[PDB]
Design an enzyme around this catalytic site. Structure first.
Site, PDB file in Angstrom:
ATOM      1  CB  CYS A 154      -0.809   0.022   1.163  1.00 13.26           C
ATOM      2  SG  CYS A 154      -0.238  -0.541   2.767  1.00 13.26           S
ATOM      3  CB  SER A 155       0.851   4.473   1.825  1.00 11.58           C
ATOM      4  OG  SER A 155       1.957   5.620   1.818  1.00 11.58           O
ATOM      5  CB  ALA A 156       3.311   2.466   5.548  1.00 14.44           C
ATOM      6  N   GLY A 170      -0.559  -1.617   6.898  1.00 15.80           N
ATOM      7  CA  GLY A 170      -1.787  -1.636   7.397  1.00 15.80           C
ATOM      8  C   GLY A 170      -2.824  -2.245   6.463  1.00 15.80           C
ATOM      9  NE  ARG A 171      -5.406   2.131   2.906  1.00 15.57           N
ATOM     10  CZ  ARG A 171      -5.574   3.452   2.057  1.00 15.57           C
ATOM     11  NH1 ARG A 171      -4.990   3.267   0.872  1.00 15.57           N
ATOM     12  NH2 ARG A 171      -6.197   4.523   2.493  1.00 15.57           N
TER      13      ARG A 171
HETATM   14  C1  LIG Z   1      -1.667   4.501  10.762  1.00 10.97           C
HETATM   15  O1  LIG Z   1      -1.721   3.527   9.461  1.00 10.97           O
HETATM   16  C2  LIG Z   1      -3.135   3.786   8.738  1.00 10.97           C
HETATM   17  C3  LIG Z   1      -4.409   4.570   9.443  1.00 10.97           C
HETATM   18  C4  LIG Z   1      -5.361   4.689   8.506  1.00 10.97           C
HETATM   19  C5  LIG Z   1      -5.515   3.914   7.147  1.00 10.97           C
HETATM   20  S1  LIG Z   1      -6.982   4.152   6.518  1.00 10.97           S
HETATM   21  O2  LIG Z   1      -6.616   4.496   5.056  1.00 10.97           O
HETATM   22  O3  LIG Z   1      -7.696   5.366   7.369  1.00 10.97           O
HETATM   23  N1  LIG Z   1      -7.955   3.203   6.706  1.00 10.97           N
HETATM   24  C6  LIG Z   1      -7.818   1.987   6.035  1.00 10.97           C
HETATM   25  O4  LIG Z   1      -7.043   1.630   5.117  1.00 10.97           O
HETATM   26  C7  LIG Z   1      -8.992   1.118   6.338  1.00 10.97           C
HETATM   27  S2  LIG Z   1     -10.245   1.314   7.860  1.00 10.97           S
HETATM   28  C8  LIG Z   1     -11.131  -0.115   7.436  1.00 10.97           C
HETATM   29  C9  LIG Z   1     -10.420  -0.283   6.248  1.00 10.97           C
HETATM   30  C10 LIG Z   1      -9.460  -0.114   5.576  1.00 10.97           C
HETATM   31  S3  LIG Z   1      -8.717  -0.708   4.217  1.00 10.97           S
HETATM   32  C11 LIG Z   1     -10.086  -1.792   3.390  1.00 10.97           C
HETATM   33  C12 LIG Z   1      -9.475  -2.421   2.363  1.00 10.97           C
HETATM   34  C13 LIG Z   1      -9.467  -1.941   1.009  1.00 10.97           C
HETATM   35  C14 LIG Z   1      -9.107  -2.517  -0.377  1.00 10.97           C
HETATM   36  C15 LIG Z   1      -8.452  -3.694   0.175  1.00 10.97           C
HETATM   37 CL1  LIG Z   1      -7.871  -4.556  -1.265  1.00 10.97          CL
HETATM   38  C16 LIG Z   1      -8.265  -4.286   1.258  1.00 10.97           C
HETATM   39 CL2  LIG Z   1      -7.468  -5.911   1.516  1.00 10.97          CL
HETATM   40  C17 LIG Z   1      -8.785  -3.792   2.543  1.00 10.97           C
HETATM   41  C18 LIG Z   1      -4.541   2.917   6.815  1.00 10.97           C
HETATM   42  C19 LIG Z   1      -3.354   2.923   7.548  1.00 10.97           C
HETATM   43  C20 LIG Z   1      -2.443   1.990   6.805  1.00 10.97           C
HETATM   44  O5  LIG Z   1      -1.121   2.331   7.253  1.00 10.97           O
HETATM   45  O6  LIG Z   1      -2.629   1.177   6.079  1.00 10.97           O
END
Ligand SMILES: COc1ccc(S(=O)(=O)NC(=O)c2sccc2SCc2ccc(Cl)c(Cl)c2)cc1C(=O)O
Length: 285
Positions: free
Chosen positions: A222-224, A227-228
């Site tokens: 994803c980015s980092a 998380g995702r």
């Molecule tokens: C501090 O880290 C973070 C904080 C917030 C976020 S965020 O962007 O605010 N919040 C989120 O990403 C959320 S919340 C429920 C679901 C998701 S992501 C849901 C998702 C979408 C597409 C795919 Cl293919 C998959 Cl496997 C899963 C992402 C991160 C991160 O680092 O990924």
């Protein structure tokens, strides 16, 4: 703490959700504590030479699991990329979890893909979200682009409602050629966070089914890249487990892969989302 039968899991989710997601909070807090008594080294990530290669200064690649690039003549740290092998349900090292590439690490990124025989890329971010830089574009908008000794050619694209599939052919000038397919989830809200799991489930199934025997690990970023990325890895693995044994072990599997890259599945909301995806898969018969 072990495999829950698939038939009780859905009831378990009701329980975790109740009283304002108290259960979910306990679980995820246990996840975040699960390394409290673990010192896990990431010396290479922290070396002054490799700093500019990390998108975020606090998001590192554990030494023991870090993907290694073949070294280059004549630098010592030309082996580093911020990326870790992570287990899937089936095999060890089923995934490479990595950050969204920087322009300065595009060559490393594609070199790793070549060296690791990776054939599938799963991208779980847009280049820019809510006016913020998340990922640099490491692929050609059209035709070809060269990154070091890898030349990448966009062959075709299918743009779905919620994700895009790009088929590339890559070539090592050293030529020898491979197909790499990129699954790019594109639907990200201007406000707040994703909520409905079904489109994601479909994205996971199709990108997962694209894996070819026998090839290198699937690259997930994803980015980092935590998380995702971790959310995808748990959903994908647990679907494998369900199909195989009809049991689920979200909390146990996640604590395990947390030793392989820091912070996989980064928020309680993502942790809950995992359950919604699996719930959708079970209820959909
Ligand atoms: C501090 O880290 C973070 C904080 C917030 C976020 S965020 O962007 O605010 N919040 C989120 O990403 C959320 S919340 C429920 C679901 C998701 S992501 C849901 C998702 C979408 C597409 C795919 Cl293919 C998959 Cl496997 C899963 C992402 C991160 C991160 O680092 O990924």
């Amino acid at each position: 703490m072990e495999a829950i039968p698939v038939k009780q899991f859905v009831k378990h989710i009701g329980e975790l959700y109740s009283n304002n997601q108290h259960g979910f909070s306990e679980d995820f807090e246990e996840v975040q504590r699960c390394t409290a008594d673990m010192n896990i080294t990431a010396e290479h990530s922290n070396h002054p030479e490799n700093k500019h290669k990390n998108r975020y200064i606090n998001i590192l690649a554990y030494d023991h699991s870090r993907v290694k690039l073949r070294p280059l003549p004549g630098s010592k740290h030309s082996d580093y990329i911020n990326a870790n092998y992570v287990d899937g349900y089936n095999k060890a090292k089923a995934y490479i979890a990595t950050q969204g590439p920087l322009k300065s690490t595009f060559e490393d990124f594609w070199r790793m893909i070549w060296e690791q025989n990776t054939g599938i890329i799963v991208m779980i971010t847009n280049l820019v979200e809510k006016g913020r830089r998340k990922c640099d574009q490491y692929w050609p908008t059209e035709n070809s682009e060269e990154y070091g000794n890898i030349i990448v050619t966009l062959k075709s694209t299918k743009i779905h409602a919620c994700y895009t599939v790009r088929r590339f052919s890559i070539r090592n000038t050293k030529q020898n050629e491979r197909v790499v397919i990129q699954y790019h989830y594109t639907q990200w809200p201007d406000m707040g966070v994703p909520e409905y799991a079904l489109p994601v489930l479909t994205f996971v199934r199709r990108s997962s089914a694209a894996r070819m025997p026998e090839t290198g690990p699937v690259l997930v970023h994803c980015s980092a890249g935590v998380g995702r990325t971790g959310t995808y890895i748990v959903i994908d693995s647990m679907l494998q487990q369900i199909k195989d044994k009809s049991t689920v072990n979200v909390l146990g599997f996640l604590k395990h892969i947390r030793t392989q890259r820091n912070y996989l599945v980064q928020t309680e909301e993502q942790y809950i989302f995992i359950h919604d995806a699996l719930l959708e898969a079970i209820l959909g018969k």
